[PDB]
Amino acid sequence: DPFIGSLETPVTSSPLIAWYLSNLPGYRTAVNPLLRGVEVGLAHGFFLVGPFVKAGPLRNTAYAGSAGSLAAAGLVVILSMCLTIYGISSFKEGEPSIAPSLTLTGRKKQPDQLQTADGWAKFTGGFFFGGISGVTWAYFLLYV
Amino acid sequence: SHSVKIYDTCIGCTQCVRACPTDVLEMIPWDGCKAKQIASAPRTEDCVGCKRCESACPTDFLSVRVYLWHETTRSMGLAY
Amino acid sequence: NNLPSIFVPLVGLVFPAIAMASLFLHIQKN
Amino acid sequence: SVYFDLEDLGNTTGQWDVYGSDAPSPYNPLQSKFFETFAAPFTKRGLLLKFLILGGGSLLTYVSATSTGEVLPIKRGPQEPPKLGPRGKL
Amino acid sequence: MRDLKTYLSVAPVISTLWFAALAGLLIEINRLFPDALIFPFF
Amino acid sequence: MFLISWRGYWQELIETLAWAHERTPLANLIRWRDKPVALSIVQARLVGLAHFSVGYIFTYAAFLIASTSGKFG
Amino acid sequence: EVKILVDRDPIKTSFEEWAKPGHFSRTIAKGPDTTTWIWNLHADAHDFDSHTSDLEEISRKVFSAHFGQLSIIFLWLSGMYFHGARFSNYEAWLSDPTHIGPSAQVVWSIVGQEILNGDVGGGFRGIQITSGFFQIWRASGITSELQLYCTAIGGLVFAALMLFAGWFHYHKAAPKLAWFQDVESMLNHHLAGLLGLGSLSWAGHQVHVSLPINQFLNAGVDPKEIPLPHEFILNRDLLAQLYPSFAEGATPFFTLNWSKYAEFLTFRGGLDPVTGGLWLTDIAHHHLAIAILFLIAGHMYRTNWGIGHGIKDILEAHKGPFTGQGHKGLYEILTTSWHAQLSINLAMLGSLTIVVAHHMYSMPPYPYLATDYGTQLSLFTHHMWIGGFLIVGAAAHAAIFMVRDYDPTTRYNDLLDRVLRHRDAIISHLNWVCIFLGFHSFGLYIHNDTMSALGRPQDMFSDTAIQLQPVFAQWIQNTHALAPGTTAPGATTSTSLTWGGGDLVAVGGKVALLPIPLGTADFLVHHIHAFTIHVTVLILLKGVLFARSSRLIPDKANLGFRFPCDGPGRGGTCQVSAWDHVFLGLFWMYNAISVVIFHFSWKMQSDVWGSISDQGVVTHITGGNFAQSSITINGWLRDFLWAQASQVIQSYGSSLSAYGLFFLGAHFVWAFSLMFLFSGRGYWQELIESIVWAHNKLKVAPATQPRALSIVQGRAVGVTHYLLGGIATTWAFFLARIIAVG
Amino acid sequence: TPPQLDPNTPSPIFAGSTGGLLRKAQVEEFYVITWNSPKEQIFEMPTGGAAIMREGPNLLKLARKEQCLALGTRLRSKYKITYQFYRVFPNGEVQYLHPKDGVYPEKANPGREGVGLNMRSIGKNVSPIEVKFTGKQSYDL
Numbered sequence A: 001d002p003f004i005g006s007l008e009t010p011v012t013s014s015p016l017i018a019w020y021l022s023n024l025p026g027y028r029t030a031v032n033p034l035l036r037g038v039e040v041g042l043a044h045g046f047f048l049v050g051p052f053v054k055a056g057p058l059r060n061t062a063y064a065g066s067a068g069s070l071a072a073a074g075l076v077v078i079l080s081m082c083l084t085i086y087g088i089s090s091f092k093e094g095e096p097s098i099a100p101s102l103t104l105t106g107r108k109k110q111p112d113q114l115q116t117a118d119g120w121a122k123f124t125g126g127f128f129f130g131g132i133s134g135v136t137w138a139y140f141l142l143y144v
Numbered sequence B: 001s002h003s004v005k006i007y008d009t010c011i012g013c014t015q016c017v018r019a020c021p022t023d024v025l026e027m028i029p030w031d032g033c034k035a036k037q038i039a040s041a042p043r044t045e046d047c048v049g050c051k052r053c054e055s056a057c058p059t060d061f062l063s064v065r066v067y068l069w070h071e072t073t074r075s076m077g078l079a080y
Numbered sequence C: 001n002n003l004p005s006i007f008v009p010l011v012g013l014v015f016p017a018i019a020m021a022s023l024f025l026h027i028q029k030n
Numbered sequence D: 001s002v003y004f005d006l007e008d009l010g011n012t013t014g015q016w017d018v019y020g021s022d023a024p025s026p027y028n029p030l031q032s033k034f035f036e037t038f039a040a041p042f043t044k045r046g047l048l049l050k051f052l053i054l055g056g057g058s059l060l061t062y063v064s065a066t067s068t069g070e071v072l073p074i075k076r077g078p079q080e081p082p083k084l085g086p087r088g089k090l
Numbered sequence E: 001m002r003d004l005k006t007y008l009s010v011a012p013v014i015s016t017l018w019f020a021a022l023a024g025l026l027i028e029i030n031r032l033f034p035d036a037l038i039f040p041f042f
Numbered sequence F: 001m002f003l004i005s006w007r008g009y010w011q012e013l014i015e016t017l018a019w020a021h022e023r024t025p026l027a028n029l030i031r032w033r034d035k036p037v038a039l040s041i042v043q044a045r046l047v048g049l050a051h052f053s054v055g056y057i058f059t060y061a062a063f064l065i066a067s068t069s070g071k072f073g
Numbered sequence G: 001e002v003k004i005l006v007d008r009d010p011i012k013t014s015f016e017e018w019a020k021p022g023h024f025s026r027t028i029a030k031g032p033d034t035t036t037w038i039w040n041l042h043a044d045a046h047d048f049d050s051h052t053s054d055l056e057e058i059s060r061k062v063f064s065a066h067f068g069q070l071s072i073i074f075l076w077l078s079g080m081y082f083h084g085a086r087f088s089n090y091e092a093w094l095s096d097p098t099h100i101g102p103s104a105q106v107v108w109s110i111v112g113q114e115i116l117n118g119d120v121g122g123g124f125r126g127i128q129i130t131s132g133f134f135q136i137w138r139a140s141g142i143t144s145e146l147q148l149y150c151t152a153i154g155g156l157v158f159a160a161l162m163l164f165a166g167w168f169h170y171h172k173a174a175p176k177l178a179w180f181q182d183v184e185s186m187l188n189h190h191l192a193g194l195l196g197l198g199s200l201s202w203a204g205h206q207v208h209v210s211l212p213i214n215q216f217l218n219a220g221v222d223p224k225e226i227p228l229p230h231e232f233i234l235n236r237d238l239l240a241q242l243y244p245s246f247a248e249g250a251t252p253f254f255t256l257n258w259s260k261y262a263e264f265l266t267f268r269g270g271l272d273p274v275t276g277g278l279w280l281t282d283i284a285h286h287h288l289a290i291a292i293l294f295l296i297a298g299h300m301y302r303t304n305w306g307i308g309h310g311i312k313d314i315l316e317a318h319k320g321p322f323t324g325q326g327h328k329g330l331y332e333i334l335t336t337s338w339h340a341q342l343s344i345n346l347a348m349l350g351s352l353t354i355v356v357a358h359h360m361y362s363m364p365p366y367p368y369l370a371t372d373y374g375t376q377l378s379l380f381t382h383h384m385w386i387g388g389f390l391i392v393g394a395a396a397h398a399a400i401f402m403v404r405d406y407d408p409t410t411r412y413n414d415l416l417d418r419v420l421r422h423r424d425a426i427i428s429h430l431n432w433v434c435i436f437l438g439f440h441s442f443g444l445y446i447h448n449d450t451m452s453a454l455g456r457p458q459d460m461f462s463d464t465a466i467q468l469q470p471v472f473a474q475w476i477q478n479t480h481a482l483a484p485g486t487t488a489p490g491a492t493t494s495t496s497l498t499w500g501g502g503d504l505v506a507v508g509g510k511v512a513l514l515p516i517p518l519g520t521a522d523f524l525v526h527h528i529h530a531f532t533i534h535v536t537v538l539i540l541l542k543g544v545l546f547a548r549s550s551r552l553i554p555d556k557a558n559l560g561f562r563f564p565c566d567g568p569g570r571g572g573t574c575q576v577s578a579w580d581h582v583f584l585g586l587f588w589m590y591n592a593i594s595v596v597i598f599h600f601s602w603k604m605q606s607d608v609w610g611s612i613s614d615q616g617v618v619t620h621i622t623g624g625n626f627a628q629s630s631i632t633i634n635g636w637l638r639d640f641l642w643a644q645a646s647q648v649i650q651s652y653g654s655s656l657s658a659y660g661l662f663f664l665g666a667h668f669v670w671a672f673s674l675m676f677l678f679s680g681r682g683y684w685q686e687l688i689e690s691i692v693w694a695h696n697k698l699k700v701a702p703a704t705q706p707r708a709l710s711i712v713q714g715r716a717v718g719v720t721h722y723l724l725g726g727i728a729t730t731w732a733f734f735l736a737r738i739i740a741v742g
Numbered sequence H: 001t002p003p004q005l006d007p008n009t010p011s012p013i014f015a016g017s018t019g020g021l022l023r024k025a026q027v028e029e030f031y032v033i034t035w036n037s038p039k040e041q042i043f044e045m046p047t048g049g050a051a052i053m054r055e056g057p058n059l060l061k062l063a064r065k066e067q068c069l070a071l072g073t074r075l076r077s078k079y080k081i082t083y084q085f086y087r088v089f090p091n092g093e094v095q096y097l098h099p100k101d102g103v104y105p106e107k108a109n110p111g112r113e114g115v116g117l118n119m120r121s122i123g124k125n126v127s128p129i130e131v132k133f134t135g136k137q138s139y140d141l
């Protein structure tokens, strides 16, 4: 549709990009949100562990990495909070999902349950658990 | 929606109706002027507040007045 | 003693977060 | 060459998912069961919020109070002898 | 001649002529009498 | 900044930013509840005046106290 | 075909149009009702595109204006030469250039301003000039004042000729439209004729006049004993004694054994030890090569004969991967409107001026120029400001074209439409880049300040705690230093001494040039420069692209180019025109140029300039504190603004006192500008109402009712006063410091 | 006049751009403008760029009423073409918007009801003190 505020470009519409983005955990519609959130949190915590231990205030002392690891965990907690409130102000208890109903081709498909109170709650819980697990794994691998 | 009012000093030159960008004002028959017509503002909910009608009005003071009031999506000029 | 080491972090960090969360939730409520 | 249909408005207004996928879950059933059973207590929202707030506050306060002077220069305190003021003030 | 005289009577030209004459008179007065802080004639 | 630059430029910038946020992947899942708009005229004037006054007061207080206390005389 | 087409006596010369002001516009010509009329009479004077619609009259007016501008420039040059001839100490400075300061102005003795006649040197009293004219005259071979007088007379004659030519080409024989629309012939004549021939003639002058006189001067001969320039032409024995190659005559040139001319056509490079400048033989060689290149390149376009190229054919027949059909209707657009050409030329001229300033400071081309610090500083800052102003004006004219000369029906271009169809992505990406660059560049400085204020000097981004070194620039510097050894066997040494590697050059006990080190501070300042440039580009591009229409206002093109707003509705629509975008980008151009000149001044004073004793040690002006004090804002405020302002504020009672006065006056003007930037028209109109009542009570009411300035006029006044005050402050501070300390 | 319908009108030839519809069209509303052209010609879209209008009936979708009115007034001023636009809601309701009486507002038409008329001079309004502590306003009286 030429009258929609979007353009078709090789980057935005390519088989490789489409496949890679559709295989990301944030776009798997059929899977329940908990398993996606667990993976997202694991990856985010494992990434976040590094910079705190590499550029922290105590980075030159012997405690450094341990302290940095703790800081990373704290950040995850804050992020989890930033998720929870976002659910409370967005999705009500009884309203259905607000995800798009039809695909690009035009076929009718089941809307994602991530945009729901229970779905978002599961996503946040999985994200918190995965973030804590990833931070712990990164610390153990780096300093053992 | 802002408030648009018309007073009886109008002489029916039809400049305000032509100046409106959202089709708010129109003309109706009247009795107390040479032109035998007067302006009106039925579609008040479509007003944005550009005040072009006041810009194009020959009188000692404007016979068409716009008072800003409660704003909404239409009066704020938002397309997103 | 050591009261500042317990009270400064509380006022500086925890209370602003609680107040911000409460105010955001109250504002966004319909 | 038409783009406006009144019968349905999802196509007319452009309500699509560009990168959505409806494929079945690739995760192993055993790992999925383990994660589902172990991550259950954090599913509730109000309980999660209250637990997060209380645990973060308590942990931060405990770490701040229990910390020694080696990590924190403020807890170590001054070491050099004091200094006098401009006009001899103490 | 009429149009040239009319142009010479326009505001910027008359202003610049008047101010040039005033500046010249002031400069010459200050040259003839170098410094002045009080009125000493009385 | 609030005392010279006016509203239309920032409104167009906000519209462009809204389009950019809407079109990107992995960030269009998050959506706002209140439509972002630029500040009003009187609000911007008030903000500029507050910034001006705060800077004035803080700068003069710092200079006065430091200069008077460095010498104590 | 190519032909000369003129119209005889299109206009009649008379004074009847001088009497009535505003004859060009009927609305202005009607008469003054209020005071605003006056303010309009000067605003629309030069808007030829609005006076009429025919292209012929506009082109003729443009031609006449160009001729008048040329006449004014010639008058200015003649005045400069006459001042150099009459009131100057050029002859005294010629013998001892190192110990005498140039001066070409003498102040009268009316009020007490005679204190401004400082002791420049050589038995003279006057104001020290920083135009660098003395070095130009020395490099040209001038050794007397009669030649300067003759040059001034010639300049006066040429100015009169230019004025007469302008009058003749407007009122007697005015070219037709087809004459101006012939771009191929104009390009051929500007490339082959204006540029190649002029540079060839200058190279001939340098070969025949400048080189022998400068060689005699460098040998140590007194300027009063040097033979006159025409003696070298008349006497071949003198030239044979100087350069034996001339004994062979012009035979080698036609014999293709050009090596015989290797005596006065060299490729050594570097700086001359005696004068601290480039070799004159290299300059003559470069001019000859440039003349050859331009003469060859001036025969590319087809005019009146079979051979040549067509610009339209070149544009249309262009095929590429990313372009496609592309440039199909650009020829008509470029040959139809003046504004697109004006924007392109303005941008190119600004970029060329910036490049000129950089190349001039890096490699000094004039004798005894590197050791005169004030001249270098003044030239750099002046050229940078001129380039910035031109670059700013280019965008404004581009917006004017896009607003009033663009129609997609008769003249359609594919590339412009493609660009206009995706402006949102461009604006969003530019905004993100600006935000990211600003955040990082300024957060580094704020972090350094905070870490230093807390007694933590080991956590800063500095050469000692956390090092961020410009590795790419250092690699380029090393490559340039090693260039003449293997990569450029023809050159004896490197082009410039700036590259890390080589020796130090000093003239007369003062440092001329030495390699410039690069560290963390250069990294930070370069990133700040990039951030400022990106923000200015964002502002100008947003102004240009959204000129015709916008999401907020779908019909912005109907309102025009210079309108204040659309109304209080839609939440507020103040400053939506492209004129407001240009007025906003002026501030950022000012900021960027100020930062650049501050960086250049501090770095040059700290790491390059200085003095040398007999032992061999070098003492710099500020003792190399740039690398450790310029990493924090407090260092910039204390070690640059506070420390280097001692000279300007203590100049009272001396010959520099005038500068100090300016250092105050500009400040005042700056503050004055704020009055026009923080207020509005209604308050002033309501006050003028009461003032007019008070006037009416005493029967002194004027017929022209006073009116407050328009919104656009107020914005223009504010921005003009702001820019003038800031620039004058910087000028006074720089000149006072560099004259008192250097 | 009786409101018309726009069942299956085609659309002009456009290559697409980023100035089109957004989430508000799917959530809140959008507008549709229909006209009739006697020949195929190129015009300028309000969203940026140029398009070509097919000969015959043409239909277009826009986001706001201001864009529709600007395009319609440009068409009337330059091409001498009659046009009409409606507003479309998410539930499918189509509301006739442009001339409701069948004639343009600038032309006086009998049978039109007057709204927002005050039969007094602008200086006859009461002071704000008279309307204090009440929900009305001085200009409303």
Ligand code: CLA
Pocket: A052, A056, A057, A058, A067, A068, A070, A071, A073, A074, A075, A077, A078, C008, C009, C011, C012, C013, C014, C017, D053, D055, D056, D057, D059, D060, D063, D071, D072
């Ligand atoms: C108002 C009070 C306040 C207080 C008390 C602190 C306190 C602190 N700041 Mg913060 N900060 C504040 C405001 C405040 N900040 C503001 C306004 C800004 C913006 C400029 C910052 C920006 C800032 C930066 C940029 C940095 C700090 C850091 C620090 C730590 C320095 C001690 C140390 O040397 O590392 C000792 C070692 C540590 C890493 C401590 C690890 C344990 C922490 C306390 C986590 C405990 C986890 C827990 C779950 C937290 C979440 C619960 C939630 C309720 C907060 C300490 C936690 C440093 C830091 O945290 O390093 C990354 C640092 O780099 N702060």
Ligand code: CLA
Pocket: A048, A051, A052, A055, A056, A057, A058, G439, G440, G442, G443, G444, G446, G447, G450, G459
């Ligand atoms: C704007 C830039 C800026 C930057 C870069 C820094 C940087 C730094 N600060 Mg300073 N600081 C700044 C401004 C800045 N500061 C300002 C404005 C203030 C207030 C005055 C301070 C005050 C301050 C304090 C009080 C302290 C520091 C300290 C530090 C260090 C702590 C780093 C850390 O723990 O968190 C890093 C945390 C991260 C989560 C990193 C996020 C960025 C990641 C890498 C993103 C990269 C994106 C990637 C390319 C994405 C691609 C996606 C693709 C793969 C698909 C760090 C070197 C601390 C110190 O002691 O250091 C010696 C300290 O205590 N800073």
Ligand code: CLA
Pocket: G062, G063, G066, G067, G070, G179, G180, G182, G185, G186, G189, G190, G193, G194
């Ligand atoms: C080879 C001959 C020739 C030369 C030397 C020039 C040179 C010049 N032209 Mg070009 N031009 C030419 C051919 C030539 N043109 C042709 C054939 C056309 C028609 C297609 C044009 C169309 C044209 C236009 C429309 C304009 C110019 C302009 C200019 C001036 C640019 C200003 C500047 O850069 O400062 C350089 C300054 C100097 C070198 C001044 C020296 C004075 C020169 C040598 C005058 C003699 C030039 C003239 C062509 C010969 C006289 C012929 C006549 C006596 C019969 C410059 C004088 C612009 C200008 O400034 O207008 C006045 C301008 O607007 N030119």
Ligand code: CLA
Pocket: G042, G043, G044, G045, G046, G047, G048, G389, G390, G392, G393, G394, G396, G397, G400, G562, G579, G582, G720
């Ligand atoms: C290369 C030459 C050049 C040329 C020929 C033009 C040509 C044109 N410009 Mg462009 N322009 C240029 C460069 C140029 N511009 C640059 C570099 C900029 C960036 C600042 C602009 C920005 C610009 C703007 C913002 C506008 C134009 C417009 C116009 C048109 C109207 C001209 C006018 O009426 O001024 C006649 C002269 C004046 C009004 C004099 C004003 C007083 C100046 C500002 C004071 C400077 C003071 C002095 C330096 C300091 C000493 C103080 C002392 C006197 C006490 C004209 C077609 C105007 C237009 O309407 O276009 C359609 C318009 O609005 N131009």
Ligand code: CLA
Pocket: F001, F004, F005, G431, G434, G435, G436, G437, G438, G439, G442, G443, G446, G535, G538, G539, G584, G587
């Ligand atoms: C010195 C004061 C000042 C400052 C700081 C700014 C700042 C800015 N200007 Mg404004 N502006 C000013 C004066 C100023 N302006 C003036 C006088 C004018 C003339 C009218 C303008 C006109 C203007 C225009 C025309 C434009 C801007 C734009 C911008 C933005 C550039 C993007 C970027 O660099 O952001 C990065 C951020 C910074 C450089 C600001 C400082 C942030 C530091 C690092 C602190 C961060 C610390 C930390 C996060 C704080 C947390 C503490 C808290 C929790 C308690 C930025 C917000 C441009 C824009 O918005 O496009 C993007 C733009 O187009 N400005």
Ligand SMILES: CC1=C(/C=C/C(C)=C/C=C/C(C)=C/C=C/C=C(C)/C=C/C=C(C)/C=C/C2=C(C)CCCC2(C)C)C(C)(C)CCC1
Pocket: G077, G150, G151, G152, G153, G154, G155, G158, G197, G198, G200, G201
């Ligand atoms: C500084 C100045 C001035 C002056 C100037 C002058 C003095 C100039 C001169 C000039 C000149 C004096 C020039 C010349 C030129 C020449 C030429 C351009 C030539 C050419 C030639 C040729 C081209 C040749 C050819 C040939 C060949 C190749 C071979 C054989 C044959 C023949 C010979 C033909 C004045 C006052 C004005 C003004 C101010 C400044």
Ligand SMILES: CC1=C(/C=C/C(C)=C/C=C/C(C)=C/C=C/C=C(C)/C=C/C=C(C)/C=C/C2=C(C)CCCC2(C)C)C(C)(C)CCC1
Pocket: G073, G193, G194, G197, G198, G199, G201, G202
């Ligand atoms: C940058 C600038 C400047 C400067 C400029 C200059 C310096 C210029 C120069 C110029 C030049 C330097 C030019 C030249 C020219 C030349 C020519 C134009 C020539 C011609 C020739 C001829 C024509 C010849 C002829 C002949 C003969 C005689 C013989 C043989 C044959 C023949 C025919 C070839 C200034 C400061 C003003 C400022 C602004 C900017």
Ligand SMILES: CC1=C(C/C=C(\C)CCC[C@H](C)CCC[C@H](C)CCCC(C)C)C(=O)c2ccccc2C1=O
Pocket: E015, G675, G676, G677, G679, G680, G681, G684, G707, G708, G709, G710, G711, G714, G715
């Ligand atoms: C100060 C100010 C004014 C008032 C400024 C005025 C009225 C300009 C006055 C200019 C001169 C001084 C007036 C007189 C000019 C005549 C040439 C005087 C002739 C008499 C002798 C001096 C020769 C505005 O009108 C305004 C409008 C919009 C935004 C800001 C402002 C603003 O800041």
